[PDB]
Amino acid sequence: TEYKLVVVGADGVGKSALTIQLIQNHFVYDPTIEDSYRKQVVIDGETSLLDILDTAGQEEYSAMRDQYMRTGEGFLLVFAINNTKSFEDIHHYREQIKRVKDSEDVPMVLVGNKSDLPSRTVDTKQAQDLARSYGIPFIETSAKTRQGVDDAFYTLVREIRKHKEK
Ligand SMILES: C#Cc1c(F)ccc2cc(O)cc(-c3ncc4c(N5C[C@H]6CC[C@@H](C5)N6C(=O)C[C@](C)(CC5CCOCC5)C(=O)O)nc(OC[C@@]56CCCN5C[C@H](F)C6)nc4c3F)c12
Numbered sequence: 001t002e003y004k005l006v007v008v009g010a011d012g013v014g015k016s017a018l019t020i021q022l023i024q025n026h027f028v029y030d031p032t033i034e035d036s037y038r039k040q041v042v043i044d045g046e047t048s049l050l051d052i053l054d055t056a057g058q059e060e061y062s063a064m065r066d067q068y069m070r071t072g073e074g075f076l077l078v079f080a081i082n083n084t085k086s087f088e089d090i091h092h093y094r095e096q097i098k099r100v101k102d103s104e105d106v107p108m109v110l111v112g113n114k115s116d117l118p119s120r121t122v123d124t125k126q127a128q129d130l131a132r133s134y135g136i137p138f139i140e141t142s143a144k145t146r147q148g149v150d151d152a153f154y155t156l157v158r159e160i161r162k163h164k165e166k
């Protein structure tokens, strides 16, 4: 069993740091580099391979990019709790996913990262309300302390399994 997971969101939210915590178990990363990793995990008793695409690069839209994004089975929509503009951008990323997947119910999880920082600008309640409006889970994370990291990825695999049952 394999799951193709894609991590999206604004520059500097922690996409690479969350990916590296899951894959390499340490808190680290060249902001311009887009790369993929695999990890074998057991989630709710099921062994699976997670393929994680950590997105980066210039904002560009093309047939090849719409094709690389379309292969994602589930998406983490990551914002940083100290960056209001990254939270405001979440609607854009959710819309792009829905556009390339040609579907209204693509597996997604809303992730509020940098939960260890004291300089919060986005309240937990604003994020919970946004996730409820989308019908998706909201997970608070810190790539620095590892709070919520496995929960964000594993919850996205559970969202994919629920979608496969429909
Ligand atoms: C995600 C997607 C997507 C899906 F999910 C699903 C399907 C897709 C299909 C595609 O064809 C295409 C995409 C898709 N690719 C890329 C996107 C993107 N990138 C990509 C990443 C994320 C932000 C920035 C630019 N990125 C960076 O890596 C920025 C840095 C690290 C900055 C460096 C540069 C050197 O100097 C120091 C800083 C960089 O290397 O350029 N930015 C935006 O939007 C940004 C906002 C803010 C400004 C205006 N713009 C419109 C809204 F207002 C939001 N969207 C993107 C996008 F949709 C999708």
Ligand SMILES: Nc1nc2c(ncn2[C@@H]2O[C@H](COP(=O)(O)OP(=O)(O)O)[C@@H](O)[C@H]2O)c(=O)[nH]1
Residues within 6 Å of the ligand: 009, 010, 011, 012, 013, 014, 015, 016, 017, 018, 028, 029, 030, 031, 113, 114, 115, 116, 117, 141, 142, 143, 144, 145
């Ligand atoms: N304190 C703290 N810093 C983080 C956390 N996640 C990422 N960072 C830092 O924020 C910056 C951007 O992180 P990065 O992973 O490159 O973001 P990306 O551009 O979304 O890939 C780096 O300096 C990271 O070390 C976190 O949860 N807490």
Ligand SMILES: [Mg+2]
Residues within 6 Å of the ligand: 015, 016, 017, 029, 030, 031, 032, 033, 054, 055, 056
């Ligand atoms: Mg990165």
